[PDB]
RNA sequence: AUGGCUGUCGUCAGCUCGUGUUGUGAAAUGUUGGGUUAAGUCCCGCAACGAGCGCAACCCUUAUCCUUUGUUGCCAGCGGU
């Protein structure tokens, strides 16, 4: 469903062999992905977020990624869901006991 | 054989724990790398997050702008000298 301009495939020629049955190659020697395979994917994926959303789940958006840090925040600040747009905390979920109290001071 | 106390090296920046994570501990990580009072004191990065001891600060016997009590106290305006 090519409804945009650049979502094909990238990063370089060198990659991770595990995800071989998903990709293709480009003119930089860089490798392309098959969107035609991803379309079936998120169909599966999106409905699951809806399933938990149907059960009013708590959804978290992650990623520092300097460039789009704000964008993902603009997507969390959109509906009601949470996010981590900067330096994912190495232990917040597993050490939620104390990272909980990090909020306490805040 | 020793306490107390003392010089401790040197006022040198370093020591050790809760919780989580990676391994087997004599485990590490964190405390490490890039910049930093005179510094693990701070910022960034980071499987770490904070905590406590030194560090800083709190101490004034320190330099000085303003009031409460003039024996066995000091002088700007006025007298006797």
């Amino acid at each position: 469903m090519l409804k945009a301009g650049v979502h094909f495939g990238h990063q370089t020629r060198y990659w991770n062999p595990k995800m071989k049955p998903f990709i293709f190659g480009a003119r930089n020697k860089v490798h392309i992905i098959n969107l035609e395979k991803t379309v079936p994917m998120f169909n599966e994926a999106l409905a699951e977020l809806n399933k938990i959303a149907s059960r009013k789940g708590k959804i978290l958006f992650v990623g520092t990624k300097r460039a789009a840090s704000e964008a993902v925040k603009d997507a969390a600040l959109s509906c009601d869901q949470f996010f981590v747009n900067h330096r994912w905390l190495g232990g917040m979920l597993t050490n939620w006991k104390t990272v909980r109290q990090s909020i306490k001071r805040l």
Side-chain angles (χ1 to χ4, degrees):
Chain A
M1 191 178 269
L2 202 167
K3 302 303 177 180
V6 51
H7 51 309
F8 40 108
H10 212 282
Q11 286 71 57
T12 177
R13 70 289 193 170
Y14 50 100
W15 53 299
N16 188 299
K18 301 291 78 175
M19 290 200 281
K20 182 179 296 300
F22 280 110
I23 62 175
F24 282 107
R27 304 298 71 67
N28 175 270
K29 294 191 61 55
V30 52
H31 281 58
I32 308 178
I33 304 174
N34 193 243
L35 291 295
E36 297 61 62
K37 187 69 170 298
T38 305
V39 182
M41 299 297 98
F42 71 67
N43 192 297
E44 317 180 307
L46 293 184
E48 282 296 297
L49 285 174
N50 202 301
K51 180 207 68 172
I52 45 178
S54 296
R55 279 63 185 180
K56 289 72 68 179
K58 296 175 290 299
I59 303 75
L60 184 69
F61 307 141
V62 184
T64 311
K65 201 278 186 176
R66 180 172 60 275
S69 61
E70 299 184 299
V72 61
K73 178 187 297 180
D74 296 299
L77 293 176
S78 75
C79 182
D80 204 301
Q81 301 318 307
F82 311 105
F83 67 114
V84 184
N85 68 304
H86 283 123
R87 53 185 174 297
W88 171 279
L89 182 54
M92 52 186 234
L93 279 63
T94 172
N95 215 301
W96 200 55
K97 186 179 74 175
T98 68
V99 180
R100 171 271 301 181
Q101 62 189 63
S102 180
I103 308 304
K104 183 276 186 176
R105 286 80 79 170
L106 188 58

